[PDB]
From Swiss-Prot, chain A:
Subcellular compartments: Cell membrane; Membrane, Caveola; Endosome; Membrane
Similarity section: Belongs to the band 7/mec-2 family. Flotillin subfamily.
Originating species: Homo sapiens (Human)
Name of this protein: Flotillin-2
Full protein segment contained here: 215 to 268 of 428
Known function: May act as a scaffolding protein within caveolar membranes, functionally participating in formation of caveolae or caveolae-like vesicles. May be involved in epidermal cell adhesion and epidermal structure and function.
Tissues and organs where the protein is expressed, per its UniProt entry: In skin, expressed in epidermis and epidermal appendages but not in dermis. Expressed in all layers of the epidermis except the basal layer. In hair follicles, expressed in the suprabasal layer but not the basal layer. Also expressed in melanoma and carcinoma cell lines, fibroblasts and foreskin melanocytes.
Domain of life, source organism: Eukaryota
Species classification: Eukaryota, Metazoa, Chordata, Craniata, Vertebrata
Post-translational modification: ZDHHC5-catalyzed palmitoylation may be required for the formation of higher-order complexes and for neurite outgrowth in cultured neural stem cells.
Subunit-level organization: Heterooligomeric complex of flotillin-1 and flotillin-2 and caveolin-1 and caveolin-2. Interacts with ECPAS.
From Swiss-Prot, chain B:
Purpose of the protein: May act as a scaffolding protein within caveolar membranes, functionally participating in formation of caveolae or caveolae-like vesicles.
Transmembrane segments: none
Location relative to the cell: Cell membrane; Endosome; Membrane, Caveola; Melanosome
Full-sequence range covered: 258 to 308 of 427
Species annotation: Homo sapiens
Similarity comment: Belongs to the band 7/mec-2 family. Flotillin subfamily.
Disulphide bonds in the chain: none
Protein name (database record): Flotillin-1
Subunit structure: Heterooligomeric complex of flotillin-1 and flotillin-2 and caveolin-1 and caveolin-2. Interacts with ECPAS.
Amino acid sequence: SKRAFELQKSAFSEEVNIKTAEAQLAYELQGAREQQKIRQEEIEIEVVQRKKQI
Amino acid sequence: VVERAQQVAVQEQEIARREKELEARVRKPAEAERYKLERLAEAEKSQLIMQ
């Protein structure tokens, strides 16, 4: 009985840990995805500036 | 990749900025110096001939 319980508990812990591990790093994934556009505009700043430095 | 793909546009504006600035700071001073040399040489010839 102890073996059956431990096997089932470890099996459940497998996917619960998988889902958690996705959960923490979804934040970083979306953060980088947004930083793409953030830096795009932060660098378009001086593009616009140098356009009229002409 | 986004950073570099916009730094290329920064340099695309920089090439024309360098065009204008280099023209102003090199070509026009060269023309002015050539005119100055022409006029001073003409004056020196005019003085030397009649002396």
